[PDB]
Amino acid sequence: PDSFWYGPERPLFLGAFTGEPPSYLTGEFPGDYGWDTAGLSADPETFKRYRELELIHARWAMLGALGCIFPELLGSYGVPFGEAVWFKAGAQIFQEGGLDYLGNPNLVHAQSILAILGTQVLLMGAIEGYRVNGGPLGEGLDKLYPGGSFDPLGLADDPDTFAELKVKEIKNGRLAMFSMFGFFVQAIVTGKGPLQNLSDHLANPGTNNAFAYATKFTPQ
Amino acid sequence: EWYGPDRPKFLGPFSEGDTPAYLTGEFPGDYGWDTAGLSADPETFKRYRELELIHARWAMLGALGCITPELLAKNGIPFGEAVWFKAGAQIFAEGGLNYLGNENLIHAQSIIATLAFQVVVMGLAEAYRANGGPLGEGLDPLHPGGAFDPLGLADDPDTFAELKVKEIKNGRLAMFSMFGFFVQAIVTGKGPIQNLDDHLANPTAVNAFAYATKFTPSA
Amino acid sequence: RPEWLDGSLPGDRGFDPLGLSKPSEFVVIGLARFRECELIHGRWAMLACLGALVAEATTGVSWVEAGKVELDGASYAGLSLPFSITQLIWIEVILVGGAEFYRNSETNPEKRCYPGGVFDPLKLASEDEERAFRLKTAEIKHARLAMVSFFGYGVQALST
Ligand code: CHL
Ligand code: CHL
Ligand code: CLA
Ligand code: CLA
Ligand SMILES: CC1=C[C@H](O)CC(C)(C)[C@H]1/C=C/C(C)=C/C=C/C(C)=C/C=C/C=C(C)/C=C/C=C(C)/C=C/C1=C(C)C[C@H](O)CC1(C)C
Ligand SMILES: CC1=C[C@H](O)CC(C)(C)[C@H]1/C=C/C(C)=C/C=C/C(C)=C/C=C/C=C(C)/C=C/C=C(C)/C=C/C1=C(C)C[C@H](O)CC1(C)C
Numbered sequence: 301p302d303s304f305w306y307g308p309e310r311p312l313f314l315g316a317f318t319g320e321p322p323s324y325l326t327g328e329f330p331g332d333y334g335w336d337t338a339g340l341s342a343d344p345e346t347f348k349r350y351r352e353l354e355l356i357h358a359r360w361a362m363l364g365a366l367g368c369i370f371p372e373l374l375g376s377y378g379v380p381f382g383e384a385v386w387f388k389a390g391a392q393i394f395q396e397g398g399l400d401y402l403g404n405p406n407l408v409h410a411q412s413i414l415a416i417l418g419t420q421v422l423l424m425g426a427i428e429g430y431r432v433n434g435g436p437l438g439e440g441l442d443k444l445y446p447g448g449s450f451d452p453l454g455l456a457d458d459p460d461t462f463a464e465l466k467v468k469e470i471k472n473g474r475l476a477m478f479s480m481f482g483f484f485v486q487a488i489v490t491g492k493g494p495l496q497n498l499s500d501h502l503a504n505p506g507t508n509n510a511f512a513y514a515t516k517f518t519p520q
Numbered sequence: 521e522w523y524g525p526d527r528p529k530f531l532g533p534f535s536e537g538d539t540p541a542y543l544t545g546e547f548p549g550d551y552g553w554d555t556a557g558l559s560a561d562p563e564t565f566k567r568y569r570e571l572e573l574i575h576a577r578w579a580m581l582g583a584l585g586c587i588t589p590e591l592l593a594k595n596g597i598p599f600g601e602a603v604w605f606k607a608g609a610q611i612f613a614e615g616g617l618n619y620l621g622n623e624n625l626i627h628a629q630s631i632i633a634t635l636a637f638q639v640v641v642m643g644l645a646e647a648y649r650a651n652g653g654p655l656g657e658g659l660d661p662l663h664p665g666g667a668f669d670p671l672g673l674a675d676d677p678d679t680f681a682e683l684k685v686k687e688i689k690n691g692r693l694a695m696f697s698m699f700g701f702f703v704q705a706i707v708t709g710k711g712p713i714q715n716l717d718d719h720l721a722n723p724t725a726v727n728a729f730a731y732a733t734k735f736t737p738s739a
Numbered sequence: 740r741p742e743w744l745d746g747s748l749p750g751d752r753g754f755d756p757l758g759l760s761k762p763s764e765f766v767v768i769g770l771a772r773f774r775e776c777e778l779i780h781g782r783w784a785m786l787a788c789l790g791a792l793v794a795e796a797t798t799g800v801s802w803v804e805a806g807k808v809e810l811d812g813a814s815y816a817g818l819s820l821p822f823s824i825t826q827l828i829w830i831e832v833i834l835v836g837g838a839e840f841y842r843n844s845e846t847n848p849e850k851r852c853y854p855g856g857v858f859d860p861l862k863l864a865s866e867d868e869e870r871a872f873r874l875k876t877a878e879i880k881h882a883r884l885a886m887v888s889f890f891g892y893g894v895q896a897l898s899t
Contacts, residue, residue, distance in 0.1 A: 349557030391733050406821035413729050433537025443538065491739035
């Protein structure tokens, strides 16, 4: 296309020091900064599969980051969750009262983990089978951008706006995946919720940073 | 059935909509599961098939070797240590590692001697497998046959192909089970047979989820 | 048999003593709508009858009594719900109004009475001319039965 994010004049991941990007990264796909130093996308089929994997990971991680942030914020403000922290919310089902959505005893009130696992397995199996092979909500649609019933508001009719929104989606998804990797590492190292880590850093930025835990995993 | 375009797939009714084009179905165990696109290049596909089959055979042997001593000990054989993941320390025991408990069998004491012997022997064997040696040269890399098929159970090509499918399927099952062995040993800390007995005792209460907060971050 | 009972419709039974559907000449100085009205009233009648019977069987509280206990405390199938009467009525009016407003926006009376489509999961309608008509007559007959049954229930509720 003819836009700032496509073609040979697109921005690249090393600024002026990037040089010439790899030949197969011609710049016809969203979020193409020409960063394939490892050379894992030489084969176009592998490139397509990696693009699909990246997009699915991006959407899942956007959802995951939002769902990790929101309950802890609400619990900090005062909502009585069973376990507000993202990496502890799974253990609520072992509590005597069971899992309670929003802390209310009349919302969901789940008791058995086996039923949750079984229903999730069935529903998600059907969902992903429909995603791979066309189902009730469209049959002959694109694998990554089905549109149709999944774009009710008609935000992707204009091809130029469609490309712009694709770039925005991929960029926000990459940011979300980076932040989710940060979530995992901070949970492993610090042991507190991400909002707790942010509050601690804001309280004393000079000392409450990552280096404070640097001497945590040293062997003895 | 098996080889052919109308073959069983890994997603059942949801698979024929999207399957890799390079997986025609001329090889055993071709369920059309290459969602990651790691076998687009045929040479890499061949190397991955070789790796898969070697892992399959090794995991079959490993599953049998993990199960048999524990079951025999349950039947009442005085083993030094029934659990597979603690069986390696028997060499450090004061009495040494004895086959089937009896001190007149093997009675090994030194780990260095057995490790060196294994290194030399397996180096020679794997070099012969990679290049070709006394047991045939220039044969099929994965199914040499000949001196490695003394019983001649795969002379008929269709029977040979069906047996190849059975081999790869049993091997995939064995590798899955060995991964389960590793994870269960890491988490539970008991032998697989002990895990099965405990699950059979109280199926609803004791299971994997019981050890769910095992690795929760501290501090 | 009345002349205006042209037949070819599921509810043809020769019952119209007062000539409500009888066309009349006019001077200046429709059966489809009435069939749709009977259809909708009967559908709601069977829904109400089944709900009342199930409620009487399971929890045992009288259908006429339902609402007084709900206002004091909301509960469905013996399980409590976190809804007050205000939120309940607001959700009900919004959802029912949306469903209604989508319902009447159909210029075609045949689809107005018989939308089919997503509302028919199994391909039972198809293009059959006899079996589909027979099951349509079955629906209309059960609708009439449910309407008269619920009228009897309402009559028995009073003076008791
Ligand atoms: C001109 C200067 C310039 C420089 C130096 C970079 C550098 C980088 N950019 Mg780029 N950019 C630059 C200009 C621009 N970038 C971009 C847009 C982007 C995007 C969208 C992305 C990048 C990314 C990257 C990274 C790709 C290489 C990498 O993965 O590093 C890896 C190596 C390092 C970061 C160095 C190691 C860090 C540290 C010094 C060592 C760690 C020390 C630890 C204490 C030791 C570890 C502890 C152990 C024990 C566990 C890299 C950091 C990518 C990225 O962020 O990946 C991470 C990426 O997605 N850039 C734009 C807008 C068009 C630019 C404009 O000029
Ligand atoms: C029609 C339904 C149907 C569905 C949904 C599947 C789906 C599957 N088949 Mg298939 N099959 C189906 C029909 C058939 N299969 C086969 C033959 C085969 C074979 C031979 C194989 C498969 C395999 C698979 C799996 C591919 C792996 C995968 O996609 O990971 C996606 C799935 C998951 C990631 C599961 C996630 C489970 C759970 C929801 C998440 C767990 C949550 C944890 C608690 C998270 C905790 C985090 C921890 C780590 C910190 C997948 C489960 C392969 C397999 O078994 O690999 C494992 C395989 O080898 N199928 C036949 C015979 C013709 C079928 C007949 O209809
Ligand atoms: C699983 C996630 C995933 C996947 C499949 C891809 C896949 C792809 N990316 Mg994307 N990307 C991701 C995550 C991912 N990326 C994240 C998190 C970022 C932000 C840092 C980016 C930023 C990015 C840019 C800026 C560009 C790409 C490009 C590409 C393409 C070529 C690179 C390649 O061969 O990927 C193969 C990828 C894998 C085999 C996944 C390996 C993942 C390893 C195992 C994780 C561990 C290593 C990692 C460095 C850990 C540190 C994480 C963080 C601290 C850096 C390919 C379609 C280029 C392109 O052509 O765009 C279309 C391009 O310009 N990506
Ligand atoms: C190391 C073992 C190994 C190896 C090398 C292969 C290799 C292959 N398999 Mg096999 N497979 C395996 C294990 C393995 N598989 C297991 C355990 C199962 C049972 C789940 C299967 C089931 C299976 C089916 C049903 C099919 C294949 C197919 C293929 C081919 C294409 C897929 C591909 O690119 O794989 C490349 C593989 C790798 C690069 C290995 C990387 C492994 C990384 C490290 C991840 C491993 C850990 C992972 C998280 C485990 C998750 C599952 C866990 C619960 C066990 C290729 C020759 C397809 C084919 O064409 O048949 C010929 C096919 O239809 N495989
Ligand atoms: C580019 C390139 C190039 C060259 O050549 C080479 C290389 C370097 C290799 C490459 C790179 C790559 C990379 C970087 C990657 C990364 C990735 C990631 C990080 C992802 C994530 C990703 C991430 C993700 C998905 C995430 C997800 C999440 C989730 C789901 C979550 C969920 C949840 C929640 C909500 C909360 C609750 O409470 C619980 C739970 C349930 C848990
Ligand atoms: C398919 C596909 C496709 C897409 O595309 C991508 C992907 C996904 C990547 C792919 C997948 C893959 C996979 C799954 C893999 C897995 C594997 C395994 C598990 C292996 C194991 C494997 C395993 C194994 C070998 C095992 C082995 C074992 C052994 C030796 C053991 C031994 C022993 C014994 C006897 C016992 C004693 O006491 C001790 C000892 C001496 C120690």
